[PDB]
Design a protein around this ligand. Sequence first.
Ligand SMILES: CCCCCCCc1cc(=O)c2ccccc2[nH]1
Ligand SMILES: CCCCCCCc1cc(=O)c2ccccc2[nH]1
Lengths: 204, 204
Amino acid sequence: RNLRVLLDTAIPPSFCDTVSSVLLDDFNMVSLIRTSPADSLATIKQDNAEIDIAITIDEELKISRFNQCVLGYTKAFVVAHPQHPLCNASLHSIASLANYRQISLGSRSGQHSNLLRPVSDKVLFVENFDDMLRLVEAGVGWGIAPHYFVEERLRNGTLAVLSELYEPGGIDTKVYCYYNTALESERSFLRFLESARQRLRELG
Amino acid sequence: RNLRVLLDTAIPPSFCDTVSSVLLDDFNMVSLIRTSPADSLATIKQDNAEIDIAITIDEELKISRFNQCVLGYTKAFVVAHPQHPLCNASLHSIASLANYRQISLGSRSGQHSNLLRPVSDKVLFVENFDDMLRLVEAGVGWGIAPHYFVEERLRNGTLAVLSELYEPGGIDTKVYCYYNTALESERSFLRFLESARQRLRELG
Ligand SMILES: CCCCCCCc1cc(=O)c2ccccc2[nH]1
Ligand SMILES: CCCCCCCc1cc(=O)c2ccccc2[nH]1
């Protein structure tokens, strides 16, 4: 009995180490699959992907063949080159973010949800977060990326934060867990959440 | 110069005491207005309401004449009569919540956002949270209400919680602050957030 799991690129590696660790105690065949958060909800809807669990930040409660629950929380920031014109982080900057270029991720389906849809009118899409930060480091525009994708570049001064005025301490983001309805009965999955969650709580 | 503020019924009174307290230090005319969270985003869009600040949990970033920011967090639960059939709180209960009657709030505009839209197909609307809990205490159905609306009834056993399986510790919910673009310049508003937030942080 194989178990195909989905972890988007927005899941920090700490979360990743916790998921894989537990599943191996009861399940003996686990397939980890990485996807862009814009393509997470899309790939699980595919009838042929046969995805059994998915751990993404994207929001969509009414999904067929799937339930929803929360695993933990994680921070994300609005980054930009330290010399970007909007570097002032002013209240007018938070509002005029929709007037400058944003570097959001591209959806293989061309569709974005309310959470991940680009907020700005001038947008430039990319494939993964790696390609985003490169363009952001070059002052091309601003974007929203996880904390672990940016923790290093900030201490090096390579990037600057602008969301503090919007949400201090970073944009707390929910990490949902979509699980096939067939697993709601098997107690092996029950033990997974109680363990995966209790460990993520120890992080903070 | 009058200042019309909007606090939905989902804002716990602790949040309410903090908002009113600060505004009186710099502003000398403040009008507090309460609304149903389903009618919060709707009343600010009214050209005649002339609302200057709004503090609600409802999500809608692309609003004309308004910006957005986060003030704090608050918990909400899925409540039900302790003898409700779904009292088991099982994984099948969290999924079958869409099959039983829900007691959600009614929108004066008839429209609900992604956050507040009733998740279940069998729905029964009400005007405020007071009318919800009454019906919930009578085993009519389940609903989602703030923590301060339910903190008393739980210790009395009058209600039971079901969201622990979905999100332990309660459904952490963001409390946004919509402020008119005209206030982004006045430093009086700047001092409000830095004060309103720093105090809400002391709560937890
Ligand atoms: C000031 C910005 C508005 C608030 C952000 C909107 C929600 C949101 C949009 C994102 O692309 C994103 C990307 C990675 C992690 C979380 C994210 N969350
Ligand atoms: C298992 C339930 C799904 C998650 C809840 C959906 C979001 C949500 C829906 C609500 O009506 C609500 C009411 C008051 C405070 C917060 C709320 N939040």
